[PDB]
Design an enzyme around this catalytic site. Structure first.
Site, PDB file in Angstrom:
ATOM      1  N   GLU A 117       6.901  28.902  -0.989  1.00  0.00           N
ATOM      2  CA  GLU A 117       5.639  28.240  -0.647  1.00  0.00           C
ATOM      3  C   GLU A 117       5.781  26.803  -0.123  1.00  0.00           C
ATOM      4  O   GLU A 117       4.809  26.238   0.390  1.00  0.00           O
ATOM      5  CB  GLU A 117       4.637  28.334  -1.810  1.00  0.00           C
ATOM      6  CG  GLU A 117       3.199  28.530  -1.351  1.00  0.00           C
ATOM      7  CD  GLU A 117       2.154  28.614  -2.447  1.00  0.00           C
ATOM      8  OE1 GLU A 117       2.001  27.629  -3.208  1.00  0.00           O
ATOM      9  OE2 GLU A 117       1.454  29.650  -2.514  1.00  0.00           O
ATOM     10  N   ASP A 131      -4.681  20.979   3.228  1.00  0.00           N
ATOM     11  CA  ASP A 131      -4.418  22.412   3.189  1.00  0.00           C
ATOM     12  C   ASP A 131      -4.966  23.102   4.435  1.00  0.00           C
ATOM     13  O   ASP A 131      -5.588  22.464   5.285  1.00  0.00           O
ATOM     14  CB  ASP A 131      -5.200  23.070   2.050  1.00  0.00           C
TER      15      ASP A 131
END
Ligand SMILES: CC1(C)CN2C(CS/C(=N\C3CCCCC3)NC3CCCCC3)=CSC2=N1
Ligand SMILES: CC1(C)CN2C(CS/C(=N\C3CCCCC3)NC3CCCCC3)=CSC2=N1
Lengths: 426, 428
Positions: free
Chosen positions: A204, A213
């Site tokens: 990740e 994000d």
């Protein structure tokens, strides 16, 4: 005057004969069992047979050492050079193979592409075997048979003490200083670099600063949420609440792991509440439980619950069967790089797809450290013996005991040949 | 049993002092305050210059000693000896570090390059060089006759121990590092392929392309398969050996050549593209083939005006027309390179990335090659005298004194290695 040892003519031949049998059987086994039958071999196991060939080459010359001790040297001039050359070759190679093992081990842990194939298959000759032979020319030239004490003595006869000084320094540096530094360097870096966090750090990604994000949301670490706000200063205050220290932007890797453990605890609690995932998770092991968490972090609990048949097979302990099911899935279609590594973790139940530290890999490295230390432990008492009398030239009374122990310690040092085979046993 | 330099040596000492002090002083003043264009090679080149400036400063003492006596005393005798030892081992190890940098930059562009230049340079080169200067501290003293300043050892054994240490640490150990880094760079240094490697990207391992088929290298399709079983099958036959899903640049280029051949054959059968293709030069033909891999012959055939402009050799007109298109708007980085290739007819668009990296390589090569050429006559001189100490050459004192005379001339002439790095900034 001061230009006779009863005990050393019963100690030395016994010690040589012991190392000879144990060496020729021990190593010869290594050579036959790996050399030929073995098909899945490690990079360490390849150097360990290269090392075994070197130790076997020397143990074969030992019968000559025993005869030369108890009685005269009858073997002639060529065999005096040949016995000196084999010892030289063995001295240099054995240590510099251990240097290549520690060097390969560095590239295996610190650098998990692969330039190790080059080292073990082609560099090992150019770097270790060829120089070891080139370093035998002064042993080919100077070693001769001479009449002394109504006997034939076989050793290296130099024309001056300057030559003795040249070759003694070359041996201390090349034989011991130069590889000792290489060996220490590798382990110093290895122990500096030295489980679930590492897995998600690769899959990740890790970021030690506040970022935006993919859906417009402030996160830090491995996608750890601070607040639900499009502003910047509101999320910066939320960090200090969990971390406990003023940062003003930059955060350390170990504060991040602290936030990551809080999210793993959350992932576990959620799995334990989800009726479909809960029974399988409890049946799984720590390595595999960590692989299931990797999936839960990715698309959520509902996504992982969607893999119906895959879950029951994991509980039924069918790793080989549940593997092909996740390759057909939407998860493999989107990100195939991350997907394959998670399936390999379910397949093997090891951290091998992630490479470096893991379980079987640590034990594999501990094995390498034991061997290298035990090798130095053999030669160490003898070095102080070179070193004490190596500088001499009080009296003849003490000098007799010094040269006596240098004979014993070199003889006991030859146990280094018997180290590699004994290490493989049990 | 053995029983001009007093004027010529201080002349070489003076020439090397003036060129050294000014040159290194300039490198330190200029590259010391140049935060803009700072290059990795220039980072080590500042250390090399500091190491050489420290030495060039001690040369007025070397010149004085040679003509008239050692007035400077016992303390300065040790200081000139230590600085000479520091410069001797460090300068070569800095070049050895510069060689590691070129290996790490060319073999694979992790980041161990910044660690070497910013932190491994001191522990690796400076600290050992000061540790190796310790015998020169305890052994250098001034005796009487005239005052003579040099290292006074208790016997010839100590002389031999340090002479072997100097040969090994100063020449043998870094020399291997330098040769090894270079035989590796030359090895892994073997057109249109590299042009499409910059554009599409090369992959030795099997990958699903954005849409479902199995692809390898630079856009080389194999077949349609639900699993790995049929993908490797078409690959293994085309190569001519067992692949196991892995191939090298040798095989990947051989696959790219096939896809170029299919594109070229496809361009030639097209009535719109063929007259354009035939009129175009070798470099510009490769620029058109690049567009075919991205869009396809049918797509490239859409650019009517642009094609006719290339066909009419109106380069600037065709370059603006392709820049004012949806292809440029979508892929600006790839399009600009392809456009500039059609505009200039040169590889410049691609071989202006690897031009500063290629220039760094040559500079390093010249800097290393010049350094050893400077020390080569001294190495020859010492080698001859090394055999005189160990007793091979059948000659009298006339020749034994001639070598010691020439060893001193070659040593003084070797010092010019302090002047190579600054002169290289001026010329190159
Ligand atoms: C460093 C070295 C290889 C050198 N050496 C030596 C010196 S040679 C030698 N025997 C052997 C040493 C190893 C090669 C074969 C000769 N001498 C005596 C002669 C008198 C009776 C006892 C042995 C003994 S043990 C040792 N180790
Ligand atoms: C290798 C070395 C550092 C050693 N050395 C030598 C031998 S010492 C020496 N003084 C110099 C050594 C180098 C520093 C300056 C004094 N001798 C004489 C003294 C009388 C006049 C000519 C030189 C000459 S040139 C040189 N270079």
């Amino acid at each position: 005057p001061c230009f006779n040892a009863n005990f050393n003519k019963i100690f030395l031949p016994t010690i040589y004969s012991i190392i000879f049998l144990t060496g020729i059987v021990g190593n010869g086994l290594v050579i036959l069992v790996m050399g030929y039958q073995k098909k899945l071999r490690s990079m360490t196991d390849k150097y360990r047979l290269h090392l075994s060939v070197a130790d076997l080459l020397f143990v074969i010359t030992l019968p000559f050492w025993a005869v030369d001790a108890v009685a005269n040297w009858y073997f002639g001039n060529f065999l005096c050079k040949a016995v000196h050359v084999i010892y030289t070759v063995n001295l240099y190679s054995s240590v510099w193979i251990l240097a290549f093992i520690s060097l390969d081990r560095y590239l295996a842990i610190v650098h998990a592409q692969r330039p190790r194939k080059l080292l073990a298959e082609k560099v090992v000759y150019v770097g270790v075997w060829i120089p070891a032979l080139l370093l035998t020319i002064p042993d080919f030239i100077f070693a001769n048979v001479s009449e002394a004490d109504d006997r034939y003595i076989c050793d290296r006869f130099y024309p001056n003490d300057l030559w003795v000084v040249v070759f003694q320094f070359q041996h201390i540096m090349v034989g011991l200083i130069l590889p000792g530094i290489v060996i220490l360097s590798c382990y110093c870096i290895i122990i500096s670099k030295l489980n679930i966090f590492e897995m998600l750090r690769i899959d990740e990604g890790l970021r030690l600063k506040i970022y935006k994000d993919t859906e417009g949301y402030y996160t830090i670490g491995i996608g750890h949420l601070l607040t639900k706000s499009p502003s910047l200063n509101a999320a910066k205050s939320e960090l200090d609440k969990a971390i406990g220290r003023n940062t003003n932007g930059v955060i350390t890797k170990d504060e991040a792991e602290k936030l990551f453990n809080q999210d793993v605890d959350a992932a576990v609690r959620g799995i334990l509440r989800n009726a479909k995932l809960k029974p399988v998770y409890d049946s799984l092991d720590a390595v595999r439980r960590a692989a299931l968490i990797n999936m839960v972090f990715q698309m959520g609990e509902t996504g992982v619950a969607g893999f119906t048949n895959s879950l029951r097979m994991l509980q039924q302990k069918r790793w080989d069967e549940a593997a092909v099911n996740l390759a057909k899935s939407r998860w493999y279609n989107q990100t195939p790089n991350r997907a394959k590594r998670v399936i390999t973790t379910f397949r093997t139940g090891t951290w091998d797809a992630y490479g470096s530290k893991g379980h079987q890999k640590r034990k594999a490295l501990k094995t390498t450290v034991i061997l290298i230390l035990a090798f130095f432990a053999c030669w160490l008492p003898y070095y102080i013996g070179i070193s004490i009398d190596s500088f001499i030239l009080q009296g003849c009374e003490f000098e007799n005991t010094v040269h006596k122990w240098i004979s014993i310690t070199e003889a006991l040092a030859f146990f280094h040949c018997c180290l590699n085979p004994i290490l493989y046993a049990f």
